[PDB]
Design a binder for this molecule. Structure first.
Ligand SMILES: CC[C@@H](CO)N1C(=O)[C@@H](CC(=O)O)C[C@H](c2cccc(Cl)c2)[C@H]1c1ccc(Cl)cc1
Length: 106
């Protein structure tokens, strides 16, 4: 392994091949990723999701009493995704929101 630690989350809702896509996060997204330990400039989509999950957890934006919804209207995450809230269960939407904040590599 070339980095000290790594993380990745996958879902049955997105095809494997898509989750392996290599991407280069734009400024705001890269800033959030690094605030939780990420150290690179290029990631696979599943790594991006891992760190974003970590970001949500650390900022305490995840509560089961919120019935699967994350409320990020007052967080930079709300501006990254461009929505006031979203469901952690709707993965295609999450992917779509994330795609706007990056560029696919080569
Ligand atoms: C916020 C907690 C976070 C912890 O990693 N999490 C989950 O708790 C679950 C929610 C679910 O049970 O469906 C999975 C979720 C996830 C995994 C892989 C791909 C995607 Cl799009 C979402 C994933 C998640 C949810 C949102 C984001 Cl932006 C990134 C990752």
């Amino acid at each position: 392994m070339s980095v000290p630690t790594d993380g990745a989350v996958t879902t049955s809702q997105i095809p494997a091949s898509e989750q392996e896509t290599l991407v280069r996060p734009k400024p705001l997204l890269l800033k959030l990723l690094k605030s939780v330990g990420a150290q690179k400039d290029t990631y696979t989509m599943k790594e991006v999701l891992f760190y974003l999950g970590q970001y949500i957890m650390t900022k305490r934006l995840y509560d089961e009493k919120q019935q699967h919804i994350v409320y990020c209207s007052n967080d930079l995450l709300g501006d990254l995704f461009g929505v006031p809230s979203f469901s952690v269960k709707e993965h295609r939407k999450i992917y779509t929101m994330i795609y706007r904040n990056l560029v696919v590599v080569n």
